[PDB]
Each structure stands twice: as C-alpha cells, then as structure tokens.
Amino acid sequence: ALEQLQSHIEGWEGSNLTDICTQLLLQGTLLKISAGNIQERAFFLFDNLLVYCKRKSRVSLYIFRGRINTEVMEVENVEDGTADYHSNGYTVTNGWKIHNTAKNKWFVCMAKTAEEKQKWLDAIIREREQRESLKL
Numbered sequence: 746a747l748e749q750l751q752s753h754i755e756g757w758e759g760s761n762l763t764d765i766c767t768q769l770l771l772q773g774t775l776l777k778i779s780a781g782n783i784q785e786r787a788f789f790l791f792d793n794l795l796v797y798c799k800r801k802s803r804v805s806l807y808i809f810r811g812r813i814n815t816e817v818m819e820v821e822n823v824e825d826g827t828a829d830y831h832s833n834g835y836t837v838t839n840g841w842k843i844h845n846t847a848k849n850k851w852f853v854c855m856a857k858t859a860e861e862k863q864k865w866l867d868a869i870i871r872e873r874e875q876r877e878s879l880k881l
C-alpha cells in the first residue's frame with residue numbers, strides 16, 4: 746500500500762516510503778500558510794515522515810511538494826485569533842505551526858474543524874511517542 750500510494754504521487758523526491766515508513770497514520774487536506782502564501786495541500790503523516798502534496802485538478806492524483814523527517818519536526822499550537830509573522834497577518838483558526846528545520850522555516854497548518862485539528866495534533870504526538878518508545 747505504501748508503494749501504491751507513492752506511485753500515485755508525481756515528482757517524488759528522496760527515499761522511498763517502503764524504505765523508511767511502515768504505516769500511513771493519517772491523511773487529510775489542510776490550508777498551509779508559508780512564505781506569505783496560502784495554498785491547500787494534501788498532508789500524509791507516516792511513521793518517521795510527514796509529506797505534503799498538491800492535489801491535481803481533474804480539468805496519478807498528487808504532485809509531491811514537501812517532506813519532513815518527523816524526528817527533526819517541531820510543532821506548536823496556535824490559538825484561534827492569532828494573526829502574526831508566520832500567518833503573515835492572516836487570522837488563524839483551527840491552526841498550528843510546523844518547523845521544517847531543513848529549510849530553517851516554519852509554516853502554518855489550518856484544518857476545517859476543531860475536531861480535525863485535534864486529530865492531527867494527537868496523531869503527531871502518537872507518532873513521536875511510538876518512535877521514542879522501546880520496541881518489541
């Protein structure tokens with residue numbers, strides 16, 4: 746299934762899913778504020794890896810846009826109503842920030858609903874906790 750999924754993503758960069766991941770933990774679409782732009786992206790959280798893609802319009806389903814090793818990923822909650830440097834003045838709701846150390850930058854994610862934000866934050870915590878746990 747990892748190899749299937751990757752085959753549906755054009756312009757892949759870097760190591761293959763089957764080589765460094767075992768499990769798609771969560772997928773969903775989110776608004777991303779980065780470098781002053783707002784764009785919708787499909788996000789995929791795997792063990793060890795966060796990937797985001799542009800979904801192809803129907804006018805292969807995805808175009809690869811970014812990946813982050815979760816072991817160097819930092820995450821920060823954003824309180825609703827925040828409008829600041831990283832949101833470039835946009836009023837954030839249902840949001841959080843992700844640190845991409847590989848490019849020395851943060852970007853902001855926003856989910857459609859509060860429940861969806863909570864799903865993402867909990868999944869990121871669980872990925873971290875499993876990764877740090879003693880293995881069986």
Ligand SMILES: O=P(O)(O)O[C@H]1[C@H](O)[C@@H](OP(=O)(O)O)[C@@H](OP(=O)(O)O)[C@@H](OP(=O)(O)O)[C@H]1O
Binds near residue numbers: 784
């Ligand atoms: O689409 P354009 O108009 O070219 O602007 C791009 C997109 O916002 C990118 O987001 P995405 O990768 O999702 O398509 C991207 O990097 P991030 O992935 O780091 O957010 C760029 O940030 P910089 O590379 O810092 O310029 C920004 O310049």
